[PDB]
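new request in #modeling-help
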Amino acid sequence: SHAVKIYDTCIGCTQCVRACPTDVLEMVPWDGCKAGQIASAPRTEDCVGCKRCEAACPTDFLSVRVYLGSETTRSMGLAY
Amino acid sequence: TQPMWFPGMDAPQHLKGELPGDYGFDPLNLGKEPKDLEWYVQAELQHGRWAMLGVAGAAAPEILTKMGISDLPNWHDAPNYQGYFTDATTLFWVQMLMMNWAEVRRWQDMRKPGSVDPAFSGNKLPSGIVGYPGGIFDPLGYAKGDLNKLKAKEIANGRLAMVAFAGIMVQYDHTGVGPVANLVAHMSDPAHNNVFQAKFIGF
Amino acid sequence: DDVNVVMSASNALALYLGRFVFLPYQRAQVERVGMPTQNGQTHFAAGDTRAEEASFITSTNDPAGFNLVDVFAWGSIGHAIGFLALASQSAQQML
Amino acid sequence: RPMWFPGAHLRGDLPCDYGFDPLNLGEKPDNLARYREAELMHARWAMMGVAGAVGVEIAGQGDWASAQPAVIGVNGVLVAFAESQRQAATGEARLYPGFETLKRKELANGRVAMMAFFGIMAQHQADPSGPGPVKQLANHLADPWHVNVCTNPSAIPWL
Amino acid sequence: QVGPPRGTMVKILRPESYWFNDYGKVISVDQTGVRYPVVVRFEKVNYAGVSTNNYALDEVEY
Amino acid sequence: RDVQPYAGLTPCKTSKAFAKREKTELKALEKRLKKYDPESAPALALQATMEKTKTRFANYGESGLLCGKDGLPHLIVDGNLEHLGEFAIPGLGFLYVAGWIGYAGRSYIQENKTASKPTEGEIIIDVPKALGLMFQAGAWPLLAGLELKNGTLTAPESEITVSPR
Ligand code: CLA
Ligand code: CLA
Ligand code: CLA
Ligand SMILES: CC(/C=C/C=C(C)/C=C/[C@@]12O[C@]1(C)C[C@@H](O)CC2(C)C)=C\C=C\C=C(C)\C=C\C=C(C)\C=C\[C@@]12O[C@]1(C)C[C@@H](O)CC2(C)C
Ligand SMILES: CC1=C(/C=C/C(C)=C/C=C/C(C)=C/C=C/C=C(C)/C=C/C=C(C)/C=C/C2=C(C)CCCC2(C)C)C(C)(C)CCC1
Ligand code: SF4
Ligand code: SF4
């Protein structure tokens, strides 16, 4: 599957999570930002790689990054 | 508050007025800082003096030829004229050798009047305002009278002579005859020897 | 014999030149310029066993340590100079 | 302080210094020492070669290039030995084997000789190599207003 | 209070930032010991269209 | 003017191939003309075209052009004094005009950058100020020289955004 990494510049705006079409990302408590929450990618196996999270991340440069890797059935988004 | 080129409006801020010739004329704002302003005051001085000499030396062969007391050539073909002591290029290189020294010394004065004669070690230059050295440069040397008036007179005469020299350069470029010949032709038929008959026969 | 005199003399001359004139400079340069090193260590020190330095290159009774490799280098230079001289001379003679 | 024009890394210790460093090549102190010695050697060779060239040019008339043509070996070995010995020494003592104003005037006259030799090189290239530098000087002494550089059509374009 | 005061122009030092080597107004600095407390506002938008983001104290200069 | 041959190119005025070019074109014009009666407007238009061709070929002859084997003028752009009007003088005119355009643009962009909303004025051009800067850009070479000498032509390295590399 692909690799999704969350970096400490995340402000916890949740937009990456709300943008994910496969429920890869989730918000977890975190003291580093003001909002009090950082994203995470537990279900990385379900990442199709559409990079909607990167498009929806406001922080410059991006706090969420998707690195395309080994392609599985789920990553390829195949109904067959 | 000085006499102004455009009486209705007000002079620009960077033109103080004390300059010998400041009539507030700077529509395209080239003045700006005082530093390049000084580079311009000196440039205007040099252009005025050189063009006064230029107009006088481009007229004098013409006046002498037309009066018939010295059959000299026209200023434009003066370089083309043959009979000089040496080849055009030879005397040109000698000329630029002679001018390199004098003009670099003036540049040193432009940069620093104090910085700038070893030929006669007793002969020096009295200290003066930049662009107006005096001393040996004015053997007449009656500056005990009005000064700023005389400087303004030099500047305005220079400005006129430069306009005149550009005008005649264009006139030969459009008629190909001497400037005084152009002048007398305009006297002869004022309504039919003016600019409308200019044709640009040759550059 | 013209070729033999000019050639042998030239080669020996080059040898002597290497032995005394540029020998201190050459040895100073090989002191200043270390052995070739890859990633900060010599080829042999990095594992290139075939880059083991030879032993005959230091076995010399010369006061100035003019080893066999120095002899071969300067003899090559002398042979190059001599044959250049011969070749040029032949050009100037018959061409 | 004598200078290449009134009112303009360089110090008074360097002999015969006149502030002339537009390119600031001698800015670097290390390179400055090399440049000093470089000039020194250049002017020494230029004094000797000016003296040679005037002699050879005039020698049997002709030019310096005219009397120019295994022959290089003898000069090469001796000069290589002398140059290696000069190099191997230390700075500021490698010059004289065995006062200040004499160095000053030496270096000045040298710079004049270097410039003269460069002029010889340029004139020989520019001219068809017929007349030598001394012969060119004699021609200039004959009719300078009509044999100067601008009459030469090779130095300048447009004849 | 730490970091630049509000309203000052700070030069960005983050290499990856779109506004690297550019100047931006400080909106607020968070004093609760967060990693990137410095909120900097920018006249020009990045490729994402945003005009602001967060920086650390060593990622800004004034 | 009479120009010396250069780079194996004879002057167009004395070139037989140039005369052949003129002749050929004029004959083509005549052929085109022949089908029209002289009273009708195409006949006069074609005669005017023939006149224009003749005076063009004449002007190219007198203007010191060098023609080739093909018979068409060839430009000398190495800087030769006899052919400076080919490239140098129009080159100088272009450099002057293009620098005027660029300096008017630079002046307007720098002046509009001080506005409250610079990007709106970027598309809605302030025509009076624009024209003022345009006519001030007549002395572009001077003002550019001032900017170069004062160091304000070029922004310093630190202010410019660069890649992280
Ligand atoms: C020692 C310096 C020196 C001297 C005395 C000469 C002397 C001469 N040169 Mg040579 N020349 C020199 C340096 C020198 N040159 C240099 C450095 C170059 C390379 C740029 C040339 C390139 C050169 C060419 C291509 C030609 C000459 C020619 C000539 C002759 C006449 C024209 C002339 O001098 O203008 C040329 C002069 C220069 C370009 C000046 C160079 C700058 C010097 C080094 C400054 C110092 C000169 C001197 C000491 C100053 C006082 C002069 C005073 C005695 C009158 C004359 C014999 C011409 C000739 O004989 O054929 C027709 C010729 O065609 N020269
Ligand atoms: C019919 C004639 C003709 C036409 C239609 C064009 C059309 C064009 N030229 Mg060309 N050009 C021509 C003749 C022509 N040129 C001739 C005869 C020359 C010789 C001087 C040139 C030399 C030339 C250069 C060197 C350049 C152009 C460029 C351009 C383009 C933009 C020019 C401009 O003014 O933009 C508006 C002007 C600006 C935005 C200002 C930009 C800077 C300008 C182009 C030059 C000013 C800088 C200064 C003088 C230093 C020049 C350095 C140079 C010598 C290397 C445009 C496609 C430019 C281009 O497209 O390159 C990418 C360019 O760089 N032209
Ligand atoms: C303000 C005007 C302006 C100026 C001064 C420059 C200057 C420059 N540009 Mg830029 N450029 C401009 C406008 C300008 N450009 C515009 C409008 C475009 C979009 C088409 C570009 C697109 C562009 C590219 C793609 C490249 C450059 C490059 C360059 C450089 C090479 C020379 C050149 O212009 O050739 C290029 C010239 C052109 C592409 C012609 C376009 C210029 C037009 C004609 C100007 C339009 C504005 C005009 C003045 C009106 C506005 C003002 C008015 C309201 C008063 C130089 C730094 C090159 C570079 O980086 O070189 C190092 C390069 O690769 N430019
Ligand atoms: C002029 C010259 C070098 C000049 C260098 C200059 C001006 C550098 C100046 C600068 O660095 C400064 C100072 C300041 C910096 O900011 C800028 C610049 C401006 C860059 C060297 C001459 C160098 C001249 C030399 C070395 C002269 C050599 C003469 C020799 C060998 C004799 C040869 C002959 O005898 C033979 C071999 C065979 C015979 O047939 C022929 C003859 C001619 C008789
Ligand atoms: C005993 C002794 C001695 C002596 C010694 C000697 C003398 C030695 C020598 C040695 C030698 C004597 C050596 C040699 C060497 C040589 C060589 C090594 C060669 C080489 C060659 C080459 C390399 C070649 C090349 C070429 C060719 C092939 C052809 C072409 C051309 C050329 C030339 C390039 C003494 C007394 C001192 C001391 C004691 C001891
Ligand atoms: S990753 Fe970008 S979007 Fe997802 S939370 Fe952190 S900042 Fe908001
Ligand atoms: S890539 Fe598509 S799927 Fe993988 S995380 Fe970003 S948004 Fe969710």
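bot summary: The pocket of chlorophyll A (ligand 1) is lined by residues D 115-116, 118-119, 122-123, 126-127, 136-137, 140, 147-149, 151-152, 155 (CB under 6 Å).
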